[PDB]
Ligand binder design. Structure first.
Ligand SMILES: NS(=O)(=O)c1ccc(C(=O)NCC(F)(F)C(F)(F)C(F)(F)F)cc1
Ligand SMILES: [Zn+2]
Length: 258
């Protein structure tokens, strides 16, 4: 015990150990599509993942992270609302117990079945642990998942999950190409926010794609067989590992598209 997504340690409790939970730039948020203003000054995002080197996949008890080699500028995010260069460190998802919930951001109050976060850190701060202490330290690219046709590029991820069922298990996961998780369009909303799990640091530029990717029911069913618990402990399925939308407060969500 410590924080989680159970009845007794879930999002509504996190503020007790992490008072920033009630802060001024918390994530996720609802994206009201009528209120987000088109900003003709935003650039097209530059997602440069040709040289991405995945290493390992880890069940950390709250989700699973696909980890990359971020010792050099291989897979980077630039442009859009960003100044400078952000290195990909990991991706993970948040998902529901059923298809009608799971995403952290919402769009006109609609919840998607899951949400992918591609986490990047600003190289001008030298390492990730320094970057999370800065208001422009991270850029997280958020992509919604809806259930329909299978996503071919997700299958390698789904097929390794049986080997990392429980908290603390990892497996080698080399040569995975995250370009296969992108939608066709890179149109996005952006706003300043936070990590969505404790310690909830207010260090993130959020970039949320408008176009969801489609994954199959079978694919997401396999995410739902993972466990929050460690090996041999009472089984708690890893489902509903999402934080609900937080107050927007004094923030503007900008759209890259008209
Ligand atoms: N879901 S999210 O918003 O994309 C998202 C992305 C990344 C983290 C994350 O690195 N937490 C871990 C951490 F950074 F807080 C940390 F413990 F490593 C430290 F020490 F603070 F640096 C959390 C949420
Ligand atoms: Zn996340």
């Amino acid at each position: 015990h410590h924080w989680g997504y159970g009845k007794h340690n879930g999002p509504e409790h996190w503020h007790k150990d992490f008072p920033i939970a009630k802060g001024e730039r918390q994530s996720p948020v609802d994206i009201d599509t009528h209120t987000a203003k088109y900003d003709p000054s935003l650039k097209p995002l530059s997602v440069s993942y040709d040289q991405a080197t995945s290493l390992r996949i880890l069940n950390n008890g709250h989700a699973f992270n696909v980890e990359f080699d971020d010792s050099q500028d291989k897979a980077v995010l630039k442009g859009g609302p960003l100044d400078g260069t952000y290195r990909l460190i990991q991706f993970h998802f948040h998902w529901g117990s059923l298809d009608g919930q799971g995403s952290e951001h919402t769009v006109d109050k609609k919840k998607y079945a899951a949400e992918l976060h591609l986490v990047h850190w600003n190289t001008k701060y030298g390492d990730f642990g320094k970057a999370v202490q800065q208001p422009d330290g991270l850029a997280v690219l958020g992509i919604f998942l809806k259930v329909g046709s299978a996503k071919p590029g997700l299958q390698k991820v789904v097929d390794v999950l049986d080997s990392i069922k429980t908290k603390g298990k990892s497996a080698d996961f080399t040569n995975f190409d995250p370009r296969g998780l992108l939608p066709e369009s890179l149109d996005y909303w952006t706003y300043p926010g936070s990590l969505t799990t404790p310690p909830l640091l207010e260090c993130v530029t959020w970039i949320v794609l408008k176009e969801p990717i489609s994954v199959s029911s079978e694919q997401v069913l396999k995410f739902r067989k993972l466990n929050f618990n460690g090996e041999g402990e009472p089984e708690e399925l890893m489902v509903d590992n999402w934080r609900p939308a937080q107050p927007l407060k004094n923030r503007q969500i900008k759209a890259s598209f008209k």
